[PDB]
Design a binder for this molecule. Structure first.
Ligand SMILES: CCCCCCC(O)(P(=O)(O)O)P(=O)(O)O
Ligand SMILES: CCCCCCC(O)(P(=O)(O)O)P(=O)(O)O
Lengths: 280, 282
């Protein structure tokens, strides 16, 4: 009857999707929205698409990161998952990873080069997830595994390194005219400095509430272990396992790192040495 | 300088990742581990290629299920506790997304010919975009109810994107490799989804679709039917029960008997399914 006819039109056409449907799906993403080329020389408009790709990937990974860390704030406003819900926020971020994958074919149609660009995109997203996976495992299975400094730096080369290397590698492949080593050291300085300032700025220090194995915390645990300081080693673990928002307890942990282990000075010195490798 | 030398070797090499590290982040996926052949008797693909299409579709389907269960707050899958309740929502979201990109990587094992490779990756990308558009609408309607009450036509379009996505992904990759069945695979997909919604209630008559608050095919028919017939009290009671997110067995049976005797949504759904099967069989 009339029904068969409707079904018939439906199954012989592409799936139906409107601009109004698209706006519903983008609500969690729009909420978060609120120089190297001097060397590579890419045509200003090819340069725009790379910029759109990087922005899509960065903002989407942040939406997922805030759910994985149970975070209340980002860029000074309530997090998207607390407004639209965890379900809609996961699906929207994941949708945008595939929208970014689609902009790659707009960079070129040369079949050989296209394949290399997709391989770069695939490899670095695999590295970002392997690094984020290990950082989460250490935090959520604590005190099963306490990483060493060497293990921490390998995690950062995967995690933080992934999107820095992604941006740089796409640009070098497209250049009409390798700084990877330089971009790798830049990502390492950036991550250790972030961990350092999260504590020094407080002195909200949310890395303590989250129980993160940050660069300063890694130094402190291995220092107390090496010197046989049993009670202090254990006190650091107890406070991290509390998942606390209590300002007085966070200050107590910060005091151990400053007065017992000298971990803040140690980290300051480490960052300085890394910066010097470039300045000399 | 012992440092500077170490730092220099680190930045001049690829990132370090061990087999022990691979095993730790695979825990959520290994836990869930515990149509193609048919179709092939038309496409005639070689067995080596057929096996690769199969690993790809399995990777994508199982990873999708890990995320769907978080999105639905589901306590059980395949008779066992869900991965997010065992390993935590954080590791489970990360591991599922990691596997989406490992599946992408497998596509390059299907051929060494550049033009064919570009078509396979395009098909992959198109159907994952469609899967996410349909799941996005299904989640929005349920989480923001009663802001939007979908009609039968809006539901069917949501299913063509969602359930149609994986059925078309399998068939389209096979057709691209053969040395169209799409309309047929679209209808099989619609039949599959409406039958799943129907049986979840009929079997109870644990009807977890009710606990979840889902705008299922029978619930969509009931809300529009009560609106059309002016049954204001019954329309509002259906909404109230879905918004409770209840596990009470008497409350779930009360709603199913409203669809059986008051709106006749269960009989409507059974006949709708029969008519779609006839369009095929006949
Ligand atoms: C999976 C993307 C991770 C992006 C960074 C997340 C952080 O948790 P971290 O880099 O300090 O570990 P944030 O930059 O939000 O503090
Ligand atoms: C993005 C999720 C794809 C798989 C969904 C399967 C179901 O979510 P559906 O019945 O809602 O289509 P399930 O019956 O496993 O909950």
């Amino acid at each position: 009857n009339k029904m068969e006819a409707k079904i018939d039109e439906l199954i012989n056409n592409d799936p139906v999707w409107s601009s109004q449907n698209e706006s519903l799906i983008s609500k969690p993403y729009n909420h978060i929205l609120l120089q190297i080329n001097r060397v590579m020389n890419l045509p200003k408009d090819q340069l725009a698409i790379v910029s759109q790709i990087v922005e899509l990937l960065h903002n989407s990974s942040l939406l997922i990161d805030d759910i994985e860390d149970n975070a209340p704030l980002r860029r000074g406003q309530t997090t998207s998952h607390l407004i639209f819900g965890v379900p809609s926020t996961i699906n929207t971020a994941n949708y945008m990873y595939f929208r970014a994958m689609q902009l790659v074919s707009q960079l070129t149609t040369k079949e050989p080069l296209y394949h290399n660009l997709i391989t770069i995109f695939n490899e670095e997203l695999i590295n970002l997830h392997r690094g984020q996976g290990l950082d989460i495992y250490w935090r959520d299975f604590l005190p099963e595994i306490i990483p060493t400094q060497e293990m921490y730096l390998n995690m950062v080369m995967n995690k933080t390194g992934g999107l820095f290397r992604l941006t740089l590698r796409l640009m070098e492949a497209l250049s009409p005219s390798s700084l990877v080593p330089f971009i790798n050291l830049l990502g390492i300085i950036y991550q250790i400095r972030d961990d350092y300032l999260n504590l020094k700025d407080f002195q909200f220090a949310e890395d303590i509430t989250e129980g993160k194995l940050s660069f300063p915390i890694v130094h402190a645990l291995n220092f107390t272990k090496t010197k046989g300081q049993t009670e202090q080693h254990n006190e650091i673990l107890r406070i991290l396992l509390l998942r606390t928002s209590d300002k007085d307890i966070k200050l107590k942990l910060i005091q151990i790192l400053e007065f017992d282990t000298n971990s803040l000075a140690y980290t300051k010195n480490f960052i300085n040495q890394l910066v010097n490798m470039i300045k000399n």
